[PDB]
């Protein structure tokens, strides 16, 4: 399933655990459009802080 989550509002936490669980076990691809993020590109030497 290529699930699309336009908004996480009102979502059960149990359901969110379930969806990530299906990401891992059922190989779901879930796309959360609600999220905003800044990114940083680490060099391999500095690793993930």
């Amino acid at each position: 399933v290529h699930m699309t989550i336009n908004e996480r509002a009102g979502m059960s936490k149990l359901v969110a655990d379930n969806i990530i669980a299906s990401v891992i076990k059922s190989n779901w691809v879930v796309d959360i459009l609600d999220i905003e993020y800044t990114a940083e590109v680490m060099t391999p030497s500095e690793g993930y802080t």
Partner: protein, 49 residues
């Protein structure tokens, strides 16, 4: 003939069949819910019934 209802006549009957639960219905597994509030009060849609 069919059996007359006991309530239908003025006799007293001191033996009767009584339906009953086999054990206490109050098992203590009371229902509980995950309420999850609106993210933004201004975004709420009062409209449309």
């Amino acid at each position: 003939q069919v059996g007359i209802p006991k309530l239908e006549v003025d006799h007293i009957s001191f033996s009767n069949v009584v339906s009953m639960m086999t054990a206490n219905i109050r098992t203590g597994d009371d229902m509980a819910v995950e309420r999850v509030n609106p993210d933004d009060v201004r975004a709420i849609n009062i409209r449309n019934a």
